[PDB]
């Protein structure tokens, strides 16, 4: 169940309300200000990292279940989502529908959105690819 949720469900959830659009209307006060601006933020693919922990000083390093148990740390990994930021503007003429046009401002990056706890012995856990010898090295019971 957990493997299905991480691999597929996470992307599906983000691809429902990925689009948030704010419209700034013409605000007719003078003829020199008659443009209507549209700001768009969209969410694309999501990336999940391996389990990790960030210390107080800000150093981030790979975390293993053995260390997490002793240090009272949560065995979790970070989630990154590609964000497409677009803005459209159009000339608002009274009594007519607008024709929004791209204003040559389309930012192309990964944004941290939180940490997802990782179930042990899952596809995203360090122990899935560990053999019996590897588990003994990592102080984990086979």
């Amino acid at each position: 169940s957990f493997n299905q949720f991480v691999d597929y469900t996470l992307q599906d959830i983000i691809c429902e309300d990925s689009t948030l659009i704010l419209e700034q209307l013409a605000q007719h006060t003078t003829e020199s200000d008659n443009i209507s601006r549209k700001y768009e933020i969209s969410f694309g693919k999501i990336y999940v990292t391996k389990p990790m922990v960030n210390e107080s000083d800000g150093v981030t390093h790979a975390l293993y279940p053995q260390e997490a148990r002793l240090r009272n740390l949560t065995y979790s990994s970070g989630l990154f989502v590609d964000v497409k930021k677009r803005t459209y503007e159009a000339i608002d003429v009274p009594g007519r529908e607008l024709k929004y046009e791209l204003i040559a401002e389309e930012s192309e990056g990964k944004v941290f959105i939180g940490r997802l706890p990782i179930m042990l012995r899952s596809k995203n856990c360090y122990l899935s690819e560990a053999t019996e010898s590897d588990l003994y090295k990592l102080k984990e019971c086979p």
Binding site: L20, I21, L22, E23, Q24, L25, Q27
Partner: peptide
């Protein structure tokens, strides 16, 4: 005047 800020679905 309008609210000068609205959300379009």
């Amino acid at each position: 005047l309008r609210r000068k800020t609205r959300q379009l679905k």
